[PDB]
Amino acid sequence: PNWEFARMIKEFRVTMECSPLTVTDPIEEHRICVCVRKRPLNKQELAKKEIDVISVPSKCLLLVHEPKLKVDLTKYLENQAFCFDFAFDETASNEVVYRFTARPLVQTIFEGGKATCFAYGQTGSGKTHTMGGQNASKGIYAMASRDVFLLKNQPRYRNLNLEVYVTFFEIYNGKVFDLLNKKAKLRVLEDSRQQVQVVGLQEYLVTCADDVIKMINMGSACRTSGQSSRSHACFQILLRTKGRLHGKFSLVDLAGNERGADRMEGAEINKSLLALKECIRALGQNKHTPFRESKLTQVLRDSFIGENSRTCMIAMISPGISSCEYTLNTLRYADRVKELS
Ligand SMILES: Nc1ncnc2c1ncn2[C@@H]1O[C@H](COP(=O)(O)OP(=O)(O)O)[C@@H](O)[C@H]1O
Ligand code: BEF
Ligand SMILES: [Mg+2]
């Protein structure tokens, strides 16, 4: 009679009663990981006496303390619960976030796989802080790379004779721009073999964590260079052997999810994120493609269609009261993503 409700509940209950061993366990595929990270209220927000309306009372639970008025003007809270594979609170460092989000996926590229990790959320919520880090080394791009190098110099993987390359680009108004090559506008193509090639995208050999941080810092400066969440940034790590691609980790600082204004680049952003949602779900459901395509999902197409492909989504949350409607929007996107599995 009410199976659907029962099932949603089962899924809720299962995602609560879970440890860190489930995602980090190999010996069982965990193709889709979804997390949430609350950032702290900052100085400017405290300066406007903004209320913090988020709590993270467990490693799996996030609470939104939604402020409400009764019809008669009586104030009250609607305390709404959301569960995720992991839930990081206002104290969690980038290193802690990295350890349970992307770090597990590193190994996937070494096993000939394609990985993807997405920072998703409203503008000002911590997407770039998480992935990019002025200081690249405090980010996930850097940390992923650090660990990619350690895996390379392990016994298990020395035999493979692997060279590490990196790419770094920005997707803005459906055009791709190479950030390791002075914002060079590139041309995206569908090969008659149905597969996507970014023409002119510079890959650059790297030998060393610090090399990579050098490249990230350069690409970052090239992004700004003037005067983000206007556009998507994607930083890839490629393992090649004989020029032949072994595996690939694409790490993406998405664009601001907040679009219902009506400068209707916000339409492009919306179709991207809807498409991304469908591609992520397509993943677990070897299933044809994002359905109203976007570049983002063109360029990243290979990293979902694969049989040996993992992904991880990190919903970012601004804890302020004035962000509450955005927060609830971020969380509901995330809900539906995790909904597969
Ligand atoms: N987890 C965090 N801890 C401390 N400060 C943060 C955190 N997340 C974001 N910030 C602050 O927010 C700004 C970073 O931009 P960010 O919010 O990451 O971009 P985006 O709007 O793409 O999410 C900086 O002022 C940074 O110090
Ligand atoms: F929201 Be962003 F500038 F990746
Ligand atoms: Mg940003």
Swiss-Prot record:
Phosphorylation by AURKB, regulates association with centromeres and kinetochores and the microtubule depolymerization activity. Ubiquitinated. Changing residue 72 to A: Loss of microtubule depolymerization activity. It comes from the Eukaryota. It is found in: Cytoplasm, Cytoskeleton; Nucleus; Chromosome, Centromere; Chromosome, Centromere, Kinetochore. The modification Phosphoserine is found at residue 272. ATP binds at residues 37, 121-128. Residues 31-340 form the Kinesin motor domain. Interacts with CENPH. Interacts with MTUS2/TIP150; the interaction is direct. Interacts with MAPRE1; the interaction is direct, regulated by phosphorylation and is probably required for targeting to growing microtubule plus ends. Interacts with KIF18B at microtubule tips; this interaction increases the affinity of both partners for microtubule plus ends and is required for robust microtubule depolymerization. Phosphorylation by AURKA or AURKB strongly reduces KIF18B-binding. Belongs to the TRAFAC class myosin-kinesin ATPase superfamily. Kinesin family. MCAK/KIF2 subfamily. The microtubule tip localization signal (MtLS) motif; mediates interaction with MAPRE1 and targeting to the growing microtubule plus ends. In complex with KIF18B, constitutes the major microtubule plus-end depolymerizing activity in mitotic cells. Regulates the turnover of microtubules at the kinetochore and functions in chromosome segregation during mitosis. Plays a role in chromosome congression and is required for the lateral to end-on conversion of the chromosome-microtubule attachment. This is Kinesin-like protein KIF2C.
